[PDB]
Every structure is written in structure tokens, then in C-alpha cells.
Amino acid sequence: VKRTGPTDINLRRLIRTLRKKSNEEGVKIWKDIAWRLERPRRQRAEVNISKINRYTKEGDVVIVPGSVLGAGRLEHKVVVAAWKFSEAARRKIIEAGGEAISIEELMERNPKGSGVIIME
Amino acid sequence: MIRRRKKVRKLRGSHTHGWGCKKKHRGGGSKGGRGMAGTGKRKDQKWTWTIKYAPDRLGKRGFHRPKAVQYIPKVINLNDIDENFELFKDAGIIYEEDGKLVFDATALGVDKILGTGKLTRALVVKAYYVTPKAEEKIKAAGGEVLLA
RNA sequence: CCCGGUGGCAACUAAGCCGCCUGGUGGAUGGCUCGGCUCGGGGCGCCGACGAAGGGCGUGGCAAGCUGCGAUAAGCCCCGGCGAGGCGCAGGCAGCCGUCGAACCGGGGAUGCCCGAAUGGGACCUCCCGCGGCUUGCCGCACUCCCAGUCGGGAGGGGGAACGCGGGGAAUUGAAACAUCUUAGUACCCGCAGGAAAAGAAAGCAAAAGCGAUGCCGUUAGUAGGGGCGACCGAAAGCGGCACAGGGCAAACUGAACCCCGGGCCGAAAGGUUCGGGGGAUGUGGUGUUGUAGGGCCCGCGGAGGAGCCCUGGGGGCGAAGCCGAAGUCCGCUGGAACGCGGCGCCGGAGAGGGUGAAAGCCCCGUAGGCGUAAGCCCCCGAGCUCCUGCGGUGUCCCUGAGUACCGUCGGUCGGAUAUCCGGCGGGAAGCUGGGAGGCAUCGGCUCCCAACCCUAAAUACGUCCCGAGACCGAUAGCGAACUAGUACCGUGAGGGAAAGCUGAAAAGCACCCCGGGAGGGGGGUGAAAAGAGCCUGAAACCAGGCGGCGAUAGGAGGGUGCGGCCCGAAAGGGUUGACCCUCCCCGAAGGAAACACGGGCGACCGUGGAGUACGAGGGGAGGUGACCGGGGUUGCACCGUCCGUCUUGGAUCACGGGGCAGGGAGUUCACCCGAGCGGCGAGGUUAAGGGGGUCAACCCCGAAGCCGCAGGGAAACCGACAGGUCCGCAGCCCGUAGGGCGAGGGACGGGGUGUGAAAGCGCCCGGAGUCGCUCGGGUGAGACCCGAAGCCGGUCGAUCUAGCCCGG
RNA sequence: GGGUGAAAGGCCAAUCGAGGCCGGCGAUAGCUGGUUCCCGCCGAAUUAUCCCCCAGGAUAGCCCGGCCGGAGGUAGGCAGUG
RNA sequence: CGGAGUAGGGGGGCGGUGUAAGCCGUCACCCGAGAGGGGAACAACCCAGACCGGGGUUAAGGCCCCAAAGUGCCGGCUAAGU
RNA sequence: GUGAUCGGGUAGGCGGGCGUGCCGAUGGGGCGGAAGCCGGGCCGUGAGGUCCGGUGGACCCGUCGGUAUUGCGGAUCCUGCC
RNA sequence: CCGUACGGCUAACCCGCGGAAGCGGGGACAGCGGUAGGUGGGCAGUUUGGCUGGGGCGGCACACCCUCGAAAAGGUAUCGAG
RNA sequence: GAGGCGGGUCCAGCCGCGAAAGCGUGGCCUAGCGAACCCCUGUGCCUCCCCGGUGGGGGCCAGGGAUGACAGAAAAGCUACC
């Protein structure tokens, strides 16, 4: 069966933007994230708060190529970029001192994406 | 969303509609018998399939007790106490006494406390039964059990 | 200008072949629709001895069919409405009815032949034959039963699509055969009711808590359970909702205090009161109707049965046929006709739908919205009138449903399993100091109830009828039937069963002349147009004539490639703003000559130089010329070519199917399971039935009952876990100049829960991703992509053929 | 599944080794016939075990499409160990 | 992870059986499911695997006429149309 | 940009397009002549689309998104005509 | 106590003749109902295998072990040999 | 690709032979037999509808009883009327 891509044109536009940004800034990460967003919907990435806590430390920056969900705890402060956040996940990240932002915001604030952790 | 068309539309002009020779898409003989025919017990045309993909379909094993006697008890784990701390507090369950903070069985009625998770707090747990690891973790976090 | 003889031609020939045109034949396609199908709504919902449904025969001035009516016969009388024409489908000749209010609509009366339950008695022909009694004219005279009683008064019988209650009861089929099973308490048969029927007020459900008559909807659940434990079959309680309602006998005690029919009176009447009869002591009426209880009796204090019914009176409301209901036919062009085009205005709580000589808010009906209403019905104020009556308890006092409960056995049935219900046979209780149930029997506890007698609305099912609506069909479709259709027609009979739509705005449906025995032909007319009833459009196959090309020395499935001849043209293709053709200059891929000078070889030939020259697909330029080209029909020459579909190792086959044309004609729907492509929420996700609102089948809100998941292992009792301890390492990041590090996802160790086991070990599981939708692919079951059996089973019809027997010839 | 039969399985309305009509019935078949537009990308098999199996079916082998994962693999040859 | 089709094979080479034709297996080049050029025509013998329009060179085989290209060259044999 | 290491194909799997009837929207045409029919041109690998002329006399098409009794040469197919 | 066998009786039941009352004959048997065993193509439903140089009879090399066939790894069939 | 059958290498227990090292899970190796359902025996535990006893029933483990058509129907013939 033909693998169409996503039907949200906002995601399609984001993917084009990521590829162009990687060609321009001279890096590999934005391309990587684009091909992970262009993955079939039944196989897309889902990550709970507990995994981020387990594998991060104070002051880390994380990119998730999918949804972030709420199950578990966060015991420090992190900056999480994701395509989608749940209400409870957003609430818990805002508590604990962190920030829950979008991939476009992150590419503005860090064009090279230096230091960023891919979590999928 | 993705509204693809049916393939009879593409098979107009195929002459056989994917089924092969013009003799192969007939009645029950073309399936080897109707339904679960031939699965063994009298005839064996689908016994090879039975022994690969469906053992324990033929035969009997065991006994069931009546529902009038079956009792299914409610249980809870410590991870869940710890992650619904605030709701249990906003509603009755978790409450204060003279000295300490105390958890009560009576949320839905729970006969057992099972010991998966961990405990970050001191707690005075009321429960008809509590498992050894659960009691020990309560201790190691600075609380007590009072069975009821 | 003489002759005679030649080789290529010419050119004209017949049948026949291809193509085009004009006609004939035929009735497709298109456009249209007073007819069908489906869903909603609950409008309406039984007819019949007061002679039904169904059938036969009659009935019109001219009348065959359908429709309507019944010897008063396409109709007779009256009361209201409407407001001038009318005399069925049905476009005629003669006439009649109507303004003294018709036709039509609503309500109500009269007449109403024969058969038919068919009923005074009989039917081989829907026709015949009698009794009485009263005066031809009239009523009555069936069977079975109740009340009676030698007088009479009553009931039943037949019909009805689907829905309803009670009995009797197959085989095909599946199990890849078949016998238990399945098909199936199905098809079909018999009986019995209604607008609904049936059920229904715990000798119940449950289980340490409690519920509280019945019926219906969603879940419980493909679960408990049945079963050659196979194929398959298969509930209930509980939970969430709709809708709500409870009353009466038998007996104990009393003992005629009672009911019905007729006549004499009173009354609107509820119903009183009198004479004469029928019932009833084998008990009419009063009482009373339930769980360790209720009632009776017995003591006693209390004596709100007063709720219903009748309508002189009365108001309101529902409720008709029926009423009212805005705004341009304004000015030009086209046209047979404006509803068109252009211009200029208006109404709108009305721009839904339809009609009118073309596409209309303003021409008409209507529509949005305001109106009124006789009977008939509801509400209440008043009017006249009724049959027994509470509370609290004492008692060695009475009562509370028998071939019943229960046991055994046989047959059927059920998921009901040692534990479902029904029936037959043999046994057979207690009976208030009593009795029953709690999934094998029995003993003891505890819990819940009182059978063997009766009635009962609402919520539910159906649509032979009516109403509205539609991603339904649009005359081979859609119901079989768009129409004089269950009709014509076929069969001894049960029974079977078609075809068939359209002139035009208006009949204006061809006046008049010639020919013809006539049907008709030809001239003339109507009309915007013959569209001429053999009537909208008018395809193909097929046929005739005309035109063009071929056509009597000739060989292949009817075609393909290339080169030519005869003929025709539109301009949608091109072209004098240059067709075709002729010559010269430049670049040029792969490839690649000859003449000629020398030489080698017996020779056919070769080598060297000429020469990588002259040429060469193609890519550019310059001048002479002045009008075709591309295309199409048919046909000649040369080369090539054994049709189409099918199974089959193998088809041109002497293998099967294949005269021509047009229209029709085959993977659908539901339930369950496995996957995917996308989307929403997310340790949670999602509502079902139903309810509330609205501009009322669309829209908005509520509703988590339940289902999946969040913890598993185990036949069961039961027990009950890593939200990260170590390492390798893809992407990626960091340091750098190769190397070196960190490393989600992934992989490997280690550790935990449970089963087994003496244990060690081994299995399954454990470090958070599922759930709800839309579409697609597939599996299983159902007719399951479409057609085809011989046969098996049920109920009915037939002995005018033929076989046998009887009576009379 | 009955009749009738000087017995031939003869006759019972052109129908008889079990009539005819309607129904169950759109019975069932492993057997026969059929299954409607275009262009591109890939592209087989008739062999093993089991079946009252041999004109049928199941489990594998041979085709296609998609996803995961992340560095070696192998249809040929040379030299060797066996 | 998902969707299939296939359970009648044949020519040619190898083996067993059989008088033989054939039967039964095996190899896996071809036909099946494969156009084009040759062998007179030919399923599998030879050359050679095919988008379209053009220009050239070769393969299998062939060069008296039918029929594109030799009545080709040198040495020898056959008298039977072999 | 690369393709000496892409260009046959039965059963069969996968991808993109043409055509038919009805619905929600949007853009439009029609008595100065719609659909349908006959004969001819141009585009398109093609399924097909569109224009010219003639006949006819009242409705029809394009695009986006949905839906379906959605495509015939054949069934000793069915109905009708020859 | 209950039985078995026999003998008798008549009043149930049966038979006949008669409007009926009865009369006569049989007789607790028979018949009727319920259950248990036997016999039972009178009547039904079914089954009656496969391989096989056609089928049939024949034969079971119809599940297994060893040698050969068997092609110097593995695999390999015949109503093939022992 | 496989139910059942057969064989191999071991870990524990309790034992035998042997001075000991060692060997022993039948027969020097390769033939000597068999699903579901039901039943019988052994053994110790789980369980039977509100609770508790008694008799009886169900379940788990092991051994056994058979289908030679041996991956397992309970089963005789004729058709010349067909």
C-alpha cells in the first residue's frame, strides 16, 4: 500500500523548513529529525516524562520527533521541544522549572542545534 | 482521510478477478469443507494447520468454579498511591491524625497492597492485608502499617 | 487522300465488389412523466342474521370495455357551504338540467334483483318447489344452545394483508461419507381472538448488603453452560433507561336482610316505588382477602364514605368543509409566442413548490403569516340522586384453595448439566403446634416467602388504508401491472400468466381541380416548422436507385509495409507575411570509396601512397520559381501474413463455443476476527439506549451503564513484580585531525513475581502505550461473483385417456 | 409408496422402476460454461509430508509489497585443511 | 508484517526397466510465459533475448536461375543422376 | 546527475490515469438555438477530448470534494429487429 | 403376611336378540390403558475404501528394518531386485 | 513446516559392581507398534452455587485398556427398466 505522508500541511511545511535549514547552516540534525517526522503514523515516537528524567541532567535540551506524554516525574529543569505535548506533561514540565517549546522556536534559538539530545 | 478506491474497479477486464484458473473459485470443495471441518477428531485435511497454529483447540482441560463463589478483590500499588497523593488528599482518603499522615482502605475498598514502585514519604497505612516488600518499603521510607 | 498487315495502347461491356449521397425498413438514443420503490409519522384501525366480504345478471337516446349504480338502476329526497355553469375515463351528433342557488364539497335519509354463513324445503348448471295465518298485497316457518314454558326474549355460525394466542410437525442441507447432532420447534397443517393481543401484583430475586408486580430498549456475552466435548448451539440475574397502579373471590361469622323480566306510576337522570312472574336454605345478599402473620369471634372508646354518577342551567377550549393574504405584465431588440437580452423600478414574517405559447419573488394558484368555525369532544361551577361504614388490644376459640405438593418410572423438550419445563402411568401428604425455596441427596443452622381461584391501564408489535419526505427508478428500468391488468390468453383441474407511454401554442386534423373500380397518386392549401394521427427526436443492421473506382488468363483468414494510377474536395489543418522544386557556400557522428603509381602471389586477390580525401544521418546560409501540400475513396505492383475466445505439455486443426445489429447482463450487504494508510485524545480512551434545547430526520448540550487498557502466574485453592544496577553500540552531539569520548531507540548481562519441584534449574511474565474513529486489503459464516442437476420432503388436483368392478341400456 | 393389473414393471388425461400442480427452493456438487477501460514497475510454479487421499484440500518451497536494523555477504576462481 | 498464484508439465542430455515404442526418476539450457534472422513449412535444432524514428557494420548460414551475393581459385576423386 | 552493470512476459502482486449517473459547493453556457444524431478536421502512447458543418427544438458543461444497480465480443446468454 | 396353581360363583367388563325395562351366553379371563423382553426387509434411512502401464479378479512390500538400484557429500521414483 | 514415536548429551537424588580410576537411565548399532473422547488403577492435594457436617460427584499428575486401510468412519450386494 502506497505510503502517503502526513496530511497536516503544517507538518509538511515544517519538514521542508528543516531540510532547508540543514543545507543552509551546514549540519545533520535537522535532516535527521525531518526523516523521523516523515515516518508512518502508526510508528511515530511517543515518550513519557520518566524517560526524559532518567536520561537527562540539569540544564539539558531535548528534541522529541513526536508526542510527549505524562507518566512519572521530573526532578530537575530541562528544555523540551516537541511536535505535541499533553496537558499534564506541559503542566509538569512548567513545574520543575523547565520550558516546553516548539521545534521552530528551538531552531530560532539554536540554529546549529549544538548540544541537543534526540529522544525517540 | 485517505479514501482509496476498491480494486474490483481496477479488475474490470481481468477475466478472473485475481483467483487464478477459471475453475478454482467454486463452493465448499474449494475450501475443503465448510467452517472448521477437517480439523481433526474425524478427518484430517486441516490437521497440519491444527498442529502448527491451533493446539489446545481440541480436547478439554480443567474446571471452573461458580461465580456465586468466585471473589475478585481490588488491589493497589504504591506507585499509584504516590502518583495520586494529591487527589486522594483532596478527597478524604489521605488525612491527618494527631501525629502523622494516614492512608485509608476505603477509596474503593482494597484488600491488598502490592509492592511495586517505591515510597517517598511517611505514611500510616490501613489495609486488611499488605505484602512483605510493601511493608518493608513503607518502613524504609519512614511509615507504619496498622492492619484492620 | 489510296490500300493491305502489324506491336503498345486506347474506350466504351454484363453480373458482381468496396465506399459516399438520396430514399425505404426498423424503433435504439436523448429529453419528459397524473406511475412505482424505500424511509419516517402515529392520523386511523375490525365488517357480518338490521343478511357481510366475495361473485353473477342487469342498468346509458345513439354505449363494446373499465368505473359507478340496482327494476326509483353513470342515479331519488333534505339540511348547510361555494357562487355559474354542468351532463364519469372520453377532444362526437342530437338535446336536457341550472339563478325557485345546480354541478362540486360536508352531514344525514330512501331504494337496494339472484347466489353466497345462506337459514321455510331442494339443487347436473346463481334456478326451482312449498306451508300457514292477515288483509292480490303481507309477516312468520333453519340448526346448536341459554332464560323460560306450552307464549315468547336472547346468543352463535361467515370474512379480515401483516402483527397476536394455543396445539401437530418434515426433508433437502452442514458435519467435506454418516446413524447422536444439525437443518428446526423451521416450511407446511388444525383450532381460537382483537384493534392491539399475551403477561402481570412474589409459596420470587439474592447473600453477611439488601431489592420489591408485568412488559420493552441497551449491555451482561459468543460468557456460564450443552455437545460423535465434534460441527455447531446457547441464557439469566444484576447494571443503565422508557413507562408506572393496584384491586377482588373461597372460608370462618350472619341466615333471606338478595338478584332478574314484565306491566302501573316519578323523574334529565342517576335510579326509587307498586302489582304479576322466574330464581335462591345443595345458601341470594352482608362480612372478609394475608406471614408466625392476616382475618373472624370477644372486650371495649370512637360513629367526616362521600366519592361518584344525571344533565333544565353555565363559561372556556379543542375541533371543518371553509376565509383573508404584498409587490411591474413599464419602455426598446430577437422571436410564431418573452418566462430572453439591455435599461428603469417595487415587495419581502412571503426569493418553498407548481402553472401559464421559451429560463417569471412582483400574470395566477399558492407561500410566510393572520382568520372563523355547526355537530362532536375535554375541563370545571352548579343541578338531583346513592350503599357499607373507624380506632387499641386479650383470648388453650374458629378459617386461610387435594388426586394438589411430593416420590418412582416412560415419552417429548430445554443452555439446564446426578441441578429446565410439559404430559402419561403407578403411588400419594400435612393442612396454622401448619407449609414452601435457597443448582446431587440427606442432617442441623440462618435468610427469604405462603402455591394449588379471578380481573387489571401506560410504556410494545403491524400497516390490506391515509399523510409527508427522498445522494432511490425513469417505460427491456421501477411493483407483474405509468394504459379498458391479476386483464387478454392457455390448461379437465389444482393452477399458470403477457404486450402495450409522447401531433401541435392552437385541430388551425388538409377547402378546390385532374387520374384511378378502389386503397391511393398528383397539383394546390394550414402551420414558425408536416410534426399528417402508419404523428417528438428518428441510430444500426438490412434493401433499392444514382455517383465514383475496379470489373470475364485467374490463388489465399480478406490484413501489414513500401512504391504508383483514377477520382474528390473542406479550410475546422497549412500555405503568396511564400507551397512545391532547382542550383551553390559552411559544419558534420559512426562509418568510408574508386580511377591512378609502384610492387607480392600459379591464381581468385592483396600491400603500400592516393586518403581518412570524395562521400555521409543530420545542423545552418544564399539565390533562382511561383501554388500547391497534408488528407480522403478505390485500386495496381513487389515483399510479408494459416481468423477470434477457450481448456490443454501442445490449437489453422477432421478438439469445444462462434448468421448480423441494437439495448440488458456477473466480488454485493451484514456480523465477528487479522493487518494497514491516515487522524483525535492520551495512563487513560470512548459513549449505548435514552433525555433537554433549537430556525425540527441536518445542528448544540447532557448521558461512562458497559467495553478495551493500566500485573501477571496458575486446572484450582491461592500467591503476587526492575517507573533503571553493568556492558556493546546505529543515528546524532562534543573534543579534535586519523584518533578520542558520550550515547535515546536497538542488543546482551544481571536481578525480581508465579507454576512445577527435595532443591538446582526450566516455562510464562516484569524497567508505562493504549484507546476511539474513517477508508482500504484479507479470513469465516450466511443464496455470498453469476448460471446449470437428477433427485429428497409437505399439502392439495385428477379415472371425459387408460385398468378394474357395480346399476341401467 | 396409493390404486388397478388373464403379470408385459403394464396402465392411472401426449407425463410412471413411484403421476401432476404449487410450496420447502435462490436445495447442494471437490464437476461444466461465463466474468465488462488504458498505460507503466516487478514477475512464478506442476515438489516434498499428511488427509476414505489420487479431477479436491492443508503445512512448507518458488513471486510481490511494506517496515526494522546497521556491516558485512556471496552464484565464480587460486592455494590449502578434511 | 501482510497479499497471492502453483499440487496434469514437455523438448534436449544422464540412469534403471522394457524386443522396442514407451514407463519411472534425475540435471535445470530452452518451450510453457519468448518477438526477430536461418534450417522448404517446424513449441523447444542453429544465431540471437524486444521502448520509438533514422544511419552503418557483422552473426547463423549462404553466392547457376527461382532468390540479395561467385557459372570464384588451386590440387585431386566419382560415371552410379551415386 | 548516473545507468557496459534499466527497457520481452502467462498465473499473480503493486503504482498512476480515461470514461459514466446522482449530492454539497464554486465558475459558467443556452430560441442570435441545449442534449442527442450524421459526416469531417486538430490534440493525445492510449483509454479519450475538443472544434467545423448539417439535422434537431429545451436543457446542459468545467473544476474541488463525496456517493454508486458505474465500462461487454463470447455465458449451445436474455428481449426485440433484420 | 404375601403369594403361586387349580375349582367354582356372579355383581364389573364382553357377545347376541330385542323400542328400553330386560332375556340368554361367556366371565374377573378377554379387551382397554401403562411398562419390560423377544421375534420381525412387512416398512424406512444409510454404508458397501484405496493404489492399479483402463477397469475387474489377483497381491497386499497400505506401518517398519538391512543390502542393492542410487549417478565416490546430501537427496532421489516405478504392481523396481534380494 | 509436525502431532505422536524413537534416539543422544547432561544436572540432582537414591543405589549396584569394584582396591580404585571408572561404568551403569535395559539388550554391541540400526526393526519389535498407536491421537482426541471415555473408562480402570496408584498417589496426594484443589473443589461441588447462604454456612457447617456425612455419603457421592468433578479436577491436576503417573501407569494401563485400540483403532495392521497402522496421523485412527461403527458398515453387504444387483441393475440388460436405469
UniProtKB/Swiss-Prot annotation, chain A:
Q: Would you indicate the residue range of the signal peptide?
A: none
What GO molecular functions are on record for this protein?
Answer: RNA binding; structural constituent of ribosome
User: Would I find Ribonucleoprotein among this entry's keywords?
Assistant: yes
Query: Single GO cellular component annotation?
Result: cytosolic large ribosomal subunit
Q: Does the keyword Ribosomal protein apply?
A: yes
- Write down the PANTHER family for this protein, in alphabetical order: 60S RIBOSOMAL PROTEIN L18 (PTHR10934), LARGE RIBOSOMAL SUBUNIT PROTEIN EL18 (PTHR10934:SF2)
Q: State the HAMAP family in the record.
A: Ribosomal_eL18 (MF_00329)
Q: What is this protein called?
A: Large ribosomal subunit protein eL18
Give the species. Answer: Thermococcus kodakarensis (strain ATCC BAA-918 / JCM 12380 / KOD1) (Pyrococcus kodakaraensis (strain KOD1))
UniProtKB/Swiss-Prot annotation, chain B:
One annotated GO biological process: translation
Gene3D superfamilies, alphabetized = 3.100.10.10, 4.10.990.10
Is Metal-binding given among the entry's keywords? no
S-S pairs: none
GO terms of molecular function? rRNA binding; structural constituent of ribosome
Q: Which Pfam families match?
A: Ribosomal_L27A
The UniProt record lists the keyword rRNA-binding:
yes
Q: Where is this region: Disordered?
A: 1-43
Q: Which domain of life is it from?
A: Archaea
Q: Spell out the PROSITE patterns in the cross-references.
A: RIBOSOMAL_L15 (PS00475)
Which keywords appear in this protein's UniProt record, sorted alphabetically? Ribonucleoprotein, Ribosomal protein, RNA-binding, rRNA-binding
**What assembly does the database describe for this protein?**
Part of the 50S ribosomal subunit.
Functionally, this protein is described as follows: Binds to the 23S rRNA.
Put simply, this protein is called: Large ribosomal subunit protein uL15
Q: What is the organism field in this record?
A: Thermococcus kodakarensis (strain ATCC BAA-918 / JCM 12380 / KOD1)
Q: Which gene encodes it?
A: rpl15
